[PDB]
Design a protein around this ligand. Structure first.
Ligand SMILES: CCCCCCCC/C=C\CCCCCCCC(=O)OC[C@H](O)CO
Ligand SMILES: CCCCCCCC/C=C\CCCCCCCC(=O)OC[C@H](O)CO
Ligand SMILES: *C\C=C(C)/C=C/C=C(C)/C=C/C1=C(C)CCCC1(C)C
Ligand SMILES: CCCCCCCC/C=C\CCCCCCCC(=O)O
Ligand SMILES: CCCCCCCC/C=C\CCCCCCCC(=O)O
Ligand SMILES: CCCCCCCC/C=C\CCCCCCCC(=O)O
Ligand SMILES: CCCCCCCC/C=C\CCCCCCCC(=O)O
Ligand SMILES: CCCCCCCC/C=C\CCCCCCCC(=O)O
Length: 264
């Protein structure tokens, strides 16, 4: 699975290799630091919204474990030899991120629907269509990147199919947001609209990283891709969760939850 990604094609300078290692290890710290924050403020969230901050804790740990796994895989697969880090064993691939996404994306979408105050039949219904659309996106994306070394054309076609799911997914999300933001309390009807645009921006970096093999097929393309993943993860998981948490607390406060009012 590692021979199919471009990381296996190149030697890396100390500077490139340590920059990638430092990017992944920093990602671990950030996520686990935000995990403590999400855990602490959960007591300031009304029971109605408390599951949202819990889902952020699930995302933080899910991401932190795969980023930590990826950093160690990175240092195991390569060895500094003759002035460059060269592939030693085949134990590093990007496929594990696509596993992180399969798991984190349903959680990220669920926390959004919860603060939108959807409930019951509509919650279960809307969540099912989003998670299926999203899994189709991720799965077709994972098939495509198996060809980023061998068959770029296939990468593209699987990229096109994956993007179809992405567009439909965002159309559902946007439609539910704009049709339900009047139900939101404390002025969060204004904040949720920004969350949506944060989503659009953060999530669009992933397909850009996905296409790096096609327009920068070299060792700096590998560094660049990890940098895009790092900006994307922090924005779609950390900042977004903070955005979701702030909305949860605000609506809790507007709903008469005392611990939420005292915290604010
Ligand atoms: C690709 C085809 C996808 C088309 C079929 C997906 C339909 C999604 C849907 O109908 O659900 C949206 C609705 O707003 C939630 O209740
Ligand atoms: C590569 C081939 C396939 C590529 C095709 C690309 C087409 C993209 C079209 C629109 C943007 C999609 C994003 C949709 C953003 C959410 C839509 C929305 O804002 O919802 C509207 C709602 O009806 C208001 O109440
Ligand atoms: C970690 C959180 C999230 C929301 C991950 C999001 C991933 C995507 C939006 C991926 C999209 C893809 C597209 C649209 C087509 C290329 C293949 C991808 C799966 C990378
Ligand atoms: C304060 C909240 C906790 C923050 C502390 C983070 C904990 C340790 C992170 C270190 C993980 C080790 C990764 C190194 C592996 C490598 O070098 O590739
Ligand atoms: C394809 C996988 C299955 C798809 C179904 C996804 C699961 C969604 C099911 C239930 C919605 C979760 C809501 C949890 C309760 C929170 C409600 C609340 O406290 O206000
Ligand atoms: C067990 C977790 C995975 C859940 C799968 C169910 C979700 C369905 C999502 C979209 C189906 C797309 C399947 C197309 C795969 C073709 C790739 C191939 O066969 O080589
Ligand atoms: C959703 C289900 C997937 C939809 C169609 C996927 C078509 C892509 C197949 C291209 C692979 C080329 C080949 O192996 O012959
Ligand atoms: C992930 C973004 C989704 C959109 C993908 C772009 C759609 C295809 C665009 C142009 C087709 C160009 C096909 C060139 C194939 C030859 C390249 C090669 O095989 O080496």
């Amino acid at each position: 699975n590692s021979m199919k990604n471009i990381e296996s094609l190149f030697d890396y300078s100390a500077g490139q290799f340590e920059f990638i290692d430092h990017l992944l290890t920093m990602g671990v710290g950030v996520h686990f630091a935000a995990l403590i924050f999400f855990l602490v403020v959960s007591q300031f969230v009304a029971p109605k919204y408390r599951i949202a901050t819990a889902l952020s804790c699930i995302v933080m740990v899910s991401a932190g474990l795969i980023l930590n796994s990826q950093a160690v895989m990175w240092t195991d697969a390569y060895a500094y030899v003759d002035g460059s880090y060269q592939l030693q064993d085949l134990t590093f691939s990007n496929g594990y991120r696509y596993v992180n996404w399969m798991a984190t994306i349903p959680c990220l979408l669920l926390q959004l629907l919860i603060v939108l105050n959807l409930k019951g039949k509509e919650l279960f219904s809307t969540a099912t269509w989003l998670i299926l659309a999203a899994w189709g996106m991720i799965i077709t994306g994972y098939v495509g990147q198996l060809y980023e070394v061998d068959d770029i054309a296939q990468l593209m076609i699987w990229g096109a199919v994956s993007t179809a799911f992405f567009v439909v997914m965002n159309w559902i999300v946007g439609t539910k947001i704009f049709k339900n933001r009047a139900t939101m309390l404390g002025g969060t009807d204004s904040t949720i609209t920004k969350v949506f645009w944060l989503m659009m921006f953060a999530w669009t970096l992933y397909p850009i990283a996905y296409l790096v093999p096609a327009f920068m097929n070299n060792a700096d393309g590998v560094v660049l891709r990890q940098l895009l993943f790092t900006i994307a993860d922090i924005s779609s998981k950390v900042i977004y969760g903070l955005m979701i948490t702030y909305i949860a607390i605000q609506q809790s406060a507007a709903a008469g939850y005392v611990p939420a009012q005292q915290a604010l």
